[PDB]
């Protein structure tokens, strides 16, 4: 049985909490996804979580939950107690049965402070992402509230997470798609790859290192330094790398399978 890591225990509780007040009757679960279960929780990483609910949010639910979230997280490293919070909510019925691409309500992230704190909210959009979040949160999740993954989502075909995994690959292109998040993609490259590859989910680290091996030499050094940089050894400028992470990302779209090598 999967477990909550106790140093996030008190903040995930509040969450969870809060999410429910402000959600009410129209809650069906909230289950915490991620590295906090999957492995790999860094200094730097937010909480994952995931609202699923029966009908759309008001206008004013909307602005509660995003204003009080603020509240309730941090930006990413100001803190060892007090981390980034990301909450994606999602409406059942976009799940189940699945709708492709499924549509996700709302997503909270401290990316997003900026904009959230004038009040301004992303709608509900289409993001082939909940593919793969209910992907993963089938094989490692933990319910705060509602019923276990397994019970409440079913699995999507395998076309279909075939797209949601291709279609981020497709989308980086040019240096400015690349530009202020190059160890990130590399990293998610590189998980890409792996899933790709084996059919299954592993970390940013673990796949940086079952990648390293197969490539050549340069693009191995990319790698590694976004690795590096990842696990907090060393800050690059990425000012001067960022044509070797655009040779990477080319790399990758040459090389990476176009069909499940060992399906999930
Ligand atoms: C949804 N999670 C947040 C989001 O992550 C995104 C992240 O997406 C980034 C793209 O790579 C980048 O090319 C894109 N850059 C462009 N010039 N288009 C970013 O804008 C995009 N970030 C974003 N929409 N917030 O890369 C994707 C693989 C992701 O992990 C999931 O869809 O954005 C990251 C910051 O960019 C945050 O750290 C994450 O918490
Ligand atoms: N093959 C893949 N395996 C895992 N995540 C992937 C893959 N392809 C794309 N992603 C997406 O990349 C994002 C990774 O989420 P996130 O940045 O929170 O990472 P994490 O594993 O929780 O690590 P961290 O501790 O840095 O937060 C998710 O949106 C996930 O769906
Ligand atoms: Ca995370
Ligand atoms: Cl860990």
Request: glycine residues 4%; proline residues 7%; negative net charge.
């Amino acid at each position: 049985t999967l477990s909550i890591p106790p140093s996030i225990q008190c903040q995930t509780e509040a969450a969870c909490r809060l999410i429910t007040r402000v959600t009410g009757d129209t809650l069906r679960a909230i289950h915490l996804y991620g590295s906090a279960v999957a492995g790999g929780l860094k200094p730097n990483s937010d909480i994952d979580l995931l609202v699923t609910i029966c009908q759309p949010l008001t206008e004013a639910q909307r602005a509660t939950l995003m204003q009080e979230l603020l509240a309730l997280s941090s930006p990413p490293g100001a803190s060892a107690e007090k981390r980034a919070l990301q909450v994606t909510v999602v409406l059942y019925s976009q799940l189940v049965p699945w709708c492709f691409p499924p549509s996700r309500e709302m997503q909270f992230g401290e990316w997003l402070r900026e904009d959230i704190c004038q009040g301004i909210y992303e709608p509900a959009q289409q993001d082939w992402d909940m593919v793969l979040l209910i992907t993963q949160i089938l094989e490692t999740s933990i319910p705060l509230k509602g019923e276990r993954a397994e019970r409440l989502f079913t699995p999507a075909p395998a076309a279909q997470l075939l797209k949601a995994l291709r279609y981020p690959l497709d989308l980086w292109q040019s240096t400015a798609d690349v530009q202020g998040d190059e160890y990130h993609i590399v990293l998610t490259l590189a998980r890409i790859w792996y899933t790709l590859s084996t059919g299954r989910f592993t970390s940013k680290d673990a796949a940086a290192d079952w990648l390293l091996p197969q490539l050549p030499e340069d693009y191995a050094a990319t790698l590694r330094a976004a690795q590096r940089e990842y696990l907090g050894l060393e800050q690059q400028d990425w000012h001067i790398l960022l044509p070797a992470v655009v040779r990477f990302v080319d790399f990758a779209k040459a090389h990476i399978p176009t069909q499940f090598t060992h399906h999930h």
